[PDB]
Symmetry: C4
Amino acid sequence: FRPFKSPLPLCPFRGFFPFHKDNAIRLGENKDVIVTREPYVSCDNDNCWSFALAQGALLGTKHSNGTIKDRTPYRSLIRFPIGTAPVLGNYKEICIAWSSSSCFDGKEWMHVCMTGNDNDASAQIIYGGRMTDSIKSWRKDILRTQESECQCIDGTCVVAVTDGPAANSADYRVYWIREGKIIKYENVPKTKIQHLEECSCYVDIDVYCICRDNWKGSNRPWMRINNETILETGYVCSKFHSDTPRPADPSTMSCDSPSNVNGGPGVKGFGFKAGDDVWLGRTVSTSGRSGFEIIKVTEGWINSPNHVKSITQTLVSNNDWSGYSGSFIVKAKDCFQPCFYVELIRGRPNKNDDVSWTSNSIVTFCGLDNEPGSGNWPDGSNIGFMPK
Amino acid sequence: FRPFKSPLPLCPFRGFFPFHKDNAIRLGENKDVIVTREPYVSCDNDNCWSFALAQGALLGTKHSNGTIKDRTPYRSLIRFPIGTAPVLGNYKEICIAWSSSSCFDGKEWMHVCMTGNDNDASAQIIYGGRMTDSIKSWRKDILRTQESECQCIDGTCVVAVTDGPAANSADYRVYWIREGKIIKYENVPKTKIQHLEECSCYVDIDVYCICRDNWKGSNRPWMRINNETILETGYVCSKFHSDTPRPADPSTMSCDSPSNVNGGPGVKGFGFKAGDDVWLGRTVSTSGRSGFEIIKVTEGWINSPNHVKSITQTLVSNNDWSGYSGSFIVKAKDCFQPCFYVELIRGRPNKNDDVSWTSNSIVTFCGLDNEPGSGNWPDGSNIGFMPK
Amino acid sequence: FRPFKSPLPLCPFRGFFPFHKDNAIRLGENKDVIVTREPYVSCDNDNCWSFALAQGALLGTKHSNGTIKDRTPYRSLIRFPIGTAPVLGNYKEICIAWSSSSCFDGKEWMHVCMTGNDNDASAQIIYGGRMTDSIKSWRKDILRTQESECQCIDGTCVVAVTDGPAANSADYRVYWIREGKIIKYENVPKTKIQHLEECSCYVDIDVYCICRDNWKGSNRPWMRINNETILETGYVCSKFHSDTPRPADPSTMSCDSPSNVNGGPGVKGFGFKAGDDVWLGRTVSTSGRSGFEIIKVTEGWINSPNHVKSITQTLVSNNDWSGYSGSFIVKAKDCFQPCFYVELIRGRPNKNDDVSWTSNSIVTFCGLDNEPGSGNWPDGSNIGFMPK
Amino acid sequence: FRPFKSPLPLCPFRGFFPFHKDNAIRLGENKDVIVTREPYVSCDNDNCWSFALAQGALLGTKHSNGTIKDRTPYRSLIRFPIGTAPVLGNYKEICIAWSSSSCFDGKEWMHVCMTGNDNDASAQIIYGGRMTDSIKSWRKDILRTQESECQCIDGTCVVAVTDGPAANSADYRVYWIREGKIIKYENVPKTKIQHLEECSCYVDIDVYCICRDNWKGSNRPWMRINNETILETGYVCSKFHSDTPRPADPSTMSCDSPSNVNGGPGVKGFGFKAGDDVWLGRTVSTSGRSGFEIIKVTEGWINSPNHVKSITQTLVSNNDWSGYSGSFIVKAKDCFQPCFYVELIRGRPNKNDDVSWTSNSIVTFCGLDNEPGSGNWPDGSNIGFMPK
Ligand SMILES: *[C@@H]1O[C@H](CO[C@@H]2O[C@@H](C)[C@@H](O)[C@@H](O)[C@@H]2O)[C@@H](O[C@@H]2O[C@H](CO)[C@@H](O)[C@H](O)[C@H]2NC(C)=O)[C@H](O)[C@H]1NC(C)=O
Ligand SMILES: *[C@@H]1O[C@H](CO[C@@H]2O[C@@H](C)[C@@H](O)[C@@H](O)[C@@H]2O)[C@@H](O[C@@H]2O[C@H](CO)[C@@H](O)[C@H](O)[C@H]2NC(C)=O)[C@H](O)[C@H]1NC(C)=O
Ligand SMILES: *[C@@H]1O[C@H](CO[C@@H]2O[C@@H](C)[C@@H](O)[C@@H](O)[C@@H]2O)[C@@H](O[C@@H]2O[C@H](CO)[C@@H](O)[C@H](O)[C@H]2NC(C)=O)[C@H](O)[C@H]1NC(C)=O
Ligand SMILES: *[C@@H]1O[C@H](CO[C@@H]2O[C@@H](C)[C@@H](O)[C@@H](O)[C@@H]2O)[C@@H](O[C@@H]2O[C@H](CO)[C@@H](O)[C@H](O)[C@H]2NC(C)=O)[C@H](O)[C@H]1NC(C)=O
Ligand SMILES: *[C@@H]1O[C@H](CO[C@@H]2O[C@@H](C)[C@@H](O)[C@@H](O)[C@@H]2O)[C@@H](O[C@@H]2O[C@H](CO)[C@@H](O)[C@H](O)[C@H]2NC(C)=O)[C@H](O)[C@H]1NC(C)=O
Ligand SMILES: *[C@@H]1O[C@H](CO[C@@H]2O[C@@H](C)[C@@H](O)[C@@H](O)[C@@H]2O)[C@@H](O[C@@H]2O[C@H](CO)[C@@H](O)[C@H](O)[C@H]2NC(C)=O)[C@H](O)[C@H]1NC(C)=O
Ligand SMILES: *[C@@H]1O[C@H](CO[C@@H]2O[C@@H](C)[C@@H](O)[C@@H](O)[C@@H]2O)[C@@H](O[C@@H]2O[C@H](CO)[C@@H](O)[C@H](O)[C@H]2NC(C)=O)[C@H](O)[C@H]1NC(C)=O
Ligand SMILES: *[C@@H]1O[C@H](CO[C@@H]2O[C@@H](C)[C@@H](O)[C@@H](O)[C@@H]2O)[C@@H](O[C@@H]2O[C@H](CO)[C@@H](O)[C@H](O)[C@H]2NC(C)=O)[C@H](O)[C@H]1NC(C)=O
Ligand SMILES: [Ca+2]
Ligand SMILES: [Ca+2]
Ligand SMILES: [Ca+2]
Ligand SMILES: [Ca+2]
Ligand SMILES: [Ca+2]
């Protein structure tokens, strides 16, 4: 017997440490590796797992040509051992999906899988391997979700979902799902949040989601949620913004609205509230998806004149490609450990990646209450060695 | 401890939703994937699985040349993770077979595996991995079975078996098998059914099988069976027929006999009775194995002047190849969820599939009591990219 | 908790039925498959497994060249799912070995693994994965064992071992091993048996072993053994001999000594005593390792004028290559089911197998108390398609 | 439920016997095998496992070129079935690491993983798959550890760690870690030990570590440790030295200090104290990493005029390449069985290994209280057959 996961507080931490790295593109030189993108990580009682949206093709084969395309019927959410490259001999196919979220409730896995036509998509809810429920597109404009792990408290899982325009007003909802059955949803209040995509969430008593405003906000919108309702919303106060693109530091302190500067598009990212402070992942570049660093901003969660970047860890150099990033948690006795993954995109449309495909590798870090060292953990592939 | 599966009613449903898709041919471009055909799906307490008849060769190798041939000693029933491509590193060999059925009784797997000479074949019964019993060909003319999952109620499994001509009167039986031991068989009454092949079965209190009349019926024959005997037989009343080939809609309403029009040959297919209504899978083409759709026919299960196609889901376009299709169930608390798979055949003898082999990929859908969206989920292989 | 396996009687049976077939050579065309020989099968509580002596090389690679060689340091006993081809992604390495036996005692696996120099070899005893004991070569002349499953009764496992000349008087012993610890051994009495190699054993209350006389006997020597001692010895009385080479039928009835005709060399084979009758596997050819059939000889176990081949199943045609064969059992409630495997050797030194390597596939059959059909289940590889 | 491992005495033994061998380079001819080095073995309750530092590339691909380099971000500690070659379909990625140690405490696995910049590395502590603690480089000079299994007694695991110069005075510590949490560390006393690297440890009531002095000692330094503190230190008294390089036999008897002859560099190695005697692994060559033998030295553990090599097993000939070697234990009822692995390095910078990569295979032996035979178990690859 296993109990449902509880509303534990986030563990104390003061730095992030290298965890698992798959080197998937390097290992894919001989065409063994499945083409993926939008990876994430999520753990159950026994294992942490890599998840990603496969493209139904092997890296470097003719079918991998043109996998820059975001949505096809040939995409499936797949799962593979954390830190391993996804290959036919080790992967599991979770569901047909070109957008997804997964989370373990303490007893079983839940997955949310969107597929079908852009104007008529549906989200399948999988629980314990069985399709238990669904969401029908209501705005008929690319129904979509987090692309990282959802969160579950006392048996009720929470997941953020969007339907509508990428660069205009759309609908954003949170769904509460218990044992695979949709209990209720709420439209996210628009009193502060103006656009919301690809939420990266974690648990610190309540669920916190830090997301992507793809329209007007170079700062990231956020929500606080429990097993019943949305408790709080806003934008991360930090005058050091963390979307891409974004203005150079220092920028505007906007706790309650989008910055309105360098607003679109964006990239999936994450953060961790720590008291009044906030940790924020971000590309090193302010314009491109290159490099990765995480900063701690003193009093960055609140309205304050005292915002300072007290810590900056540079984990992937600006000379290396990054991509999406997202939070995940690991139960650590009486608290949840904050961890994250970074998608390292290789191929189109990256300048000088002269291949016809698009894929990624993964690297991950976890938070400890110890002082970190330093290093650099990029994709590491010589694109010139790769089958095109 | 696990109890035997019970005679649960079918769950309510109003549409079908995309579940798992393997993209096996696309992923087989580099010769990793095992050549298969006649796939199906069946689940135990912990997992749903893909099953298929392998051809003892890797796709695109010289040994794959000529795998259009239906029966060889080199065919085995194999099992692999649902939605994954079958590769040497993930498959399990269940038994030597060129015709098969599998089902889980709540405690153990049973399999029925036919092999040997066309005139002298035998069916091996496997239970919990042990060969427990057998059936010797009695008409000496290709002893054969469902090519999809059998069904088990309160420990007794039921499976439909045929021996005799493909386009003339043959023998059709149901066998009752408990813990791998044949308890009894019955010759299917011929008062209504005139020819019966490749039954697709499910459970709705009793076992329902919807099969293939390969001789005179463009409508599908069906049986209702419990743990003791055949309770009822007939043909699906729907004036919209669901075999291939078949007449255009609307055709004849024949509850008690074969249509006698476009009667032979046929293709394995499935349906689900829903009150007085019936859901029917079928190729989009009325002549070829191209496309796949599922229709709901109001009062289609009964003798009525009111037959209308209230719902039509087009899941694979008529421009894409399909093949066999079959039902499977997933336990959903106090009811069984109706699901199905579609075999997507590529290679010989499909027009313009210029390769020497014959194989397939798989796609699956499950029923929910929600409104579906729409999409298209075909094999997706560019045959021109494939090793021939 | 699991009890030790008990001394159950052999199940009733009247024919043999096709079980699992791996098609390993066919599937090895693209160099995925590990080079093996001397395969066998053995089962635990949950699964039956294939075992074989690998050659530390992939089929069709340069390192596979010359794998006709019997003993090298690069040979390991490996285990893989029954009926699957052995590949790097599915195999387990049991121990370093160029001769081996394996058996499950009801709780754990035991293995006997010989390796090292021809004149100074040692047998490692593995139990529950731990090396627990060993046998040092005492005649310093290729210490060797069954190349099929040993047998275990009430926790005590029995295994036949040989050290000395291949075509002259050597030492033959049985070892009793409990939980991996050698309890005792006995020199096999030479009052009847004159040469003994590669015993194929099974359980029918007591352990029966039917072996290979490589010197003077075209008939097979046999032993009856319990958990304490050798109870009985002899040669199979059947005037229809079952070694290879051997005289044509009918030959000599020799219950107590070697035939003294077509005496050497031989091939590993098996049989099953059934009352006063005996079932005997044998190559179809009387001179070569081609084809495979199993005969039932009425009163073949005893001294009688009434020996007749009442049954003959031809399972592999004389036009196809065979090789070693061996017995294994599967627990069937209150009796043991008799099964066997046949090694299908391809490559050197088989005439017209124009490749530089030597390997094999596997096929298996089990006994049922039903009448069999007929078929042909040979290796099935087109040697011309294979990498050389 | 499982108890923590206890402080058992080492089992009696009088020779070493061939256990598992992977033949990884031979099997890597077709580019399936992951590039590794610094392998080791460690076991839990159910299985023994191979561990190694992968290089994030497949053997024989372009990315394998230049893998002689010791530290990169693309190295991960990986785990694979003991005696199997590491391939994408069977490996698990444990953590990012270019130096590592692993050990099972009776309940869960602990790992120590160093990565990052040479001057700023950190060691991540993994326990039950979760990152639980860390060590920050304190001398900022390649923080590093055993490259073989650590040891755990009554829930407290012990591991030797080094930071500082390779050929001058550095810092050497032992860390005590319980359930992944660092309890304490001790600086190793320098009253006898002058340099310490790559400890090979085992349990004989207390933990014994036999290590590598890379500076002044051709004899190996050693420590005795319990769950609380370092109990004893020294150098192995044996006048027959066991590092590489080293003086020819007989050399100096130095129980309390480095030999001061042929002092640097060295190679990772191991030994086993047996009463007043000692068993010592060593390369056959006194100058190079070729061959492998194990000697027993009578009274070799103590100050004595009676040192004699009573036993010498030559396991890999001087004509074959060896490399690092290390101890591991297997629980054997009421004692621990001493076993070891030998890394068989192929590629750069080995003379005449004309390839661009560097990797290894593995061979293993275990101790029994029986007399051994003899043999030779080298890597076995024909380097000329390999992709360069
Ligand atoms: C939602 O969970 C609560 C328990 O969690 C607490 O309240 C949440 C809103 C959130 O603030 C958490 O962090 C808190 O720990 C459930 O409340 C229980 O309800 C039962 C039945 O009425 C009652 O017997 C218990 O006393 C309640 N427990 C507590 C701690 O108050 C509530 O039922 C959950 N709601 C849903 C819709 O599932
Ligand atoms: C990746 O694919 C493009 C496009 O391929 C073409 O269209 C595809 C849908 C498919 O039908 C292919 O068979 C077609 O070739 C390739 O670009 C083409 O390259 C060819 C050959 O050099 C050229 O003649 C065409 O004009 C190109 N077509 C377009 C639209 O640009 C491209 O070469 C492929 N990349 C790699 C690395 O193979
Ligand atoms: C077959 O199953 C029945 C129980 O299932 C019920 O009856 C079936 C014919 C079918 O209609 C199902 O949907 C029903 O739920 C077994 O009947 C039981 O028999 C035992 C022993 O006589 C008796 O004690 C129970 O009361 C019966 N249970 C019920 C519900 O009537 C029957 O034994 C099964 N037959 C065989 C041959 O296995
Ligand atoms: C697929 O196989 C056919 C037939 O192969 C021939 O017969 C087989 C049983 C086997 O023995 C092969 O070695 C034979 O080649 C191939 O058709 C043949 O192609 C060759 C070469 O072009 C031609 O000379 C023969 O006349 C053909 N034979 C027949 C009966 O048509 C075919 O080319 C193979 N397809 C592919 C893609 O390789
Ligand atoms: C060997 O096994 C016997 C039990 O098996 C029986 O005797 C064998 C020789 C063989 O004929 C089997 O087929 C029989 O079923 C063990 O005998 C038991 O010994 C214990 C302790 O003395 C005694 O209490 C039991 O009564 C005995 N059981 C029987 C059935 O007689 C014997 O101990 C075993 N010997 C060894 C060395 O392990
Ligand atoms: C299989 O191997 C033989 C022998 O290979 C030679 O000796 C080996 C130990 C190794 O060192 C190889 O590099 C050697 O080539 C091959 O037979 C040789 O073939 C070559 C080239 O045709 C010829 O010049 C030699 O005289 C042959 N040597 C002998 C002893 O016959 C054989 O070709 C290989 N088979 C295949 C299919 O590759
Ligand atoms: C360390 O372990 C001891 C038990 O192991 C014994 O003492 C070690 C130092 C070592 O010599 C082993 O080989 C010995 O077997 C723990 O001692 C126990 O402590 C508890 C609590 O005080 C006490 O109740 C028990 O009696 C002690 N057991 C024994 C055998 O003395 C000790 O707690 C451990 N220390 C740490 C820091 O974990
Ligand atoms: C292994 O690699 C070396 C070096 O490769 C060069 O530098 C690498 C970092 C990478 O950028 C490669 O593309 C470069 O080629 C190879 O040595 C080179 O070989 C080329 C071609 O013969 C030669 O022109 C260069 O001068 C060499 N460079 C150096 C520094 O020596 C080497 O050939 C590779 N080995 C194999 C087996 O492929
Ligand atoms: Ca933005
Ligand atoms: Ca028909
Ligand atoms: Ca003979
Ligand atoms: Ca491959
Ligand atoms: Ca040294």
